[PDB]
Amino acid sequence: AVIKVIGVGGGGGNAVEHMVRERIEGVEFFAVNTDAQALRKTAVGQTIQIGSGITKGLGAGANPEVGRNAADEDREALRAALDGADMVFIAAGMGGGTGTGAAPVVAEVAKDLGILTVAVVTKPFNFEGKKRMAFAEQGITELSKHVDSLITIPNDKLLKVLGRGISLLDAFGAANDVLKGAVQGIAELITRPGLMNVDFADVRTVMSEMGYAMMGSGVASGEDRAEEAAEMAISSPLLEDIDLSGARGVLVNITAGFDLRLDEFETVGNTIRAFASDNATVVIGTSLDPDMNDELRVTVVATGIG
């Protein structure tokens, strides 16, 4: 499996840098930006400059029009980077000029190539202002036209569960971890399975041409960890208002060490199928993280929600 993760713009590039640091098994990372300096800074091993860096006016690059035109002009470079992938993840912070405008073009290029294309993006914090929130939603409207699944993370919802005198860096770190959670949860079912390997056709079925999606995750240790982690995932703040019996698809990743047991696989699957519909596709897989000993994580991606 060839899986590529593309960070688009400053925010997405920061999120993908977090994914590089904290590791996602068996994926290739890319950063796509108008900002040549940013691409020079980044730890991402593959970079793609779009638009070659021409602005017209101080702050003119905050307009999504600029990101869209830049990616439009460099569609051939994007296609050469994406081609050969079985799956593409697009990460972006929506609301700025580059991510908002260029992420839907990156998605369109991937989708036109026949690649299963999953976007995981954020909306700005409320304190960033109404102009950025409006740009973000307009970009998400365009992005939804060109992806198989779209997971939109409201940064403002993350901010409320963080409180305190958190730094802005940690505020964006919280969004980064959610984005990583979603990408890693989907991709590692393919790139490093555990005792139960998912068929890629099933991943395609739950994610393909599905529209809106949402991710929740949970972790637990000890004897009841499998049921505990599944329940925490189901009840996480991101999934709590999703009726899981209204999701057209559910993809579940159980991640644990070598000591994952078959009966734990069965428990998690039975729990998830108790909340989902039989008129839905439910896919349960495992990933192996040899560094985990006692802990078990369940990540749930609900797709085709409305």
172 known member of a binding site: yes
User: Residues 7, 10, 51, 285: which binds ligand GDP (CB under 6 A)?
Assistant: 10
51 binds ligand GDP, rule: CB under 6 A: no
Q: Using the rule CB under 6 A, is 124 a contact of ligand GDP?
A: yes
Element holding 46 (H helix, E strand): strand 46-49
Q: How far apart are CB 126 and ligand GDP at their closest, in Å?
A: 10
In the bound complex, what is the minimum distance in angstroms from residue 218's beta carbon to ligand GDP? Answer: 22
Burial bucket for residue 57 (CB in 10 Å: 0-12, 13-18, 19+) = exposed
Number of CB atoms found within 10 A of residue 135's CB: 24
* Residues near ligand GDP (CB under 6 A), total: 19
CA distances from 194 to 73, 157, 207, 284 (A): 42, 33, 21, 11
Q: Which tokens in the block code for residue 105? A: 């073009």
- Asked if residue 306 lies in contact with residue 211, where contact means CB atoms within 8 angstroms, the answer is yes
Q: Is 12 annotated as a binding residue?
A: yes
Establish if 29 lies at the interface with ligand GDP (CB under 6 A).
Answer: no
- Answer yes or no whether residue 128 interacts with ligand GDP by CB under 6 A: yes
State which residue, 180 or 248, has the beta carbon closest to ligand GDP: 180
Sequential DSSP letters for 183-248: HHHHHHHHHSB-SSPPPHHHHHHHHTT-EEEEEEEEEE-STTHHHHHHHHHHTSTTTTTS-GGG-S
Q: What gap in Å lies between CA 196 and CA 229, rounded to an integer?
A: 18
Closest alpha carbon to 50 in 99, 118, 111, 92: 99
27 binds ligand GDP (CB under 6 A): no
Candidate list 7, 99, 181, 285; residue touching ligand GDP; CB under 6 A: 99
x-or-dash pattern for ligand GDP, window 56-95, by CB under 6 A?
-------------------------------------x-x
- Annotated binding residues, as ranges? 10-14, 97-99, 128, 132, 172, 176
Question: Residues interacting with ligand GDP, by CB under 6 A?
Answer: 9-11, 14-15, 93, 95-99, 122, 124, 128, 132, 155, 172, 175-176
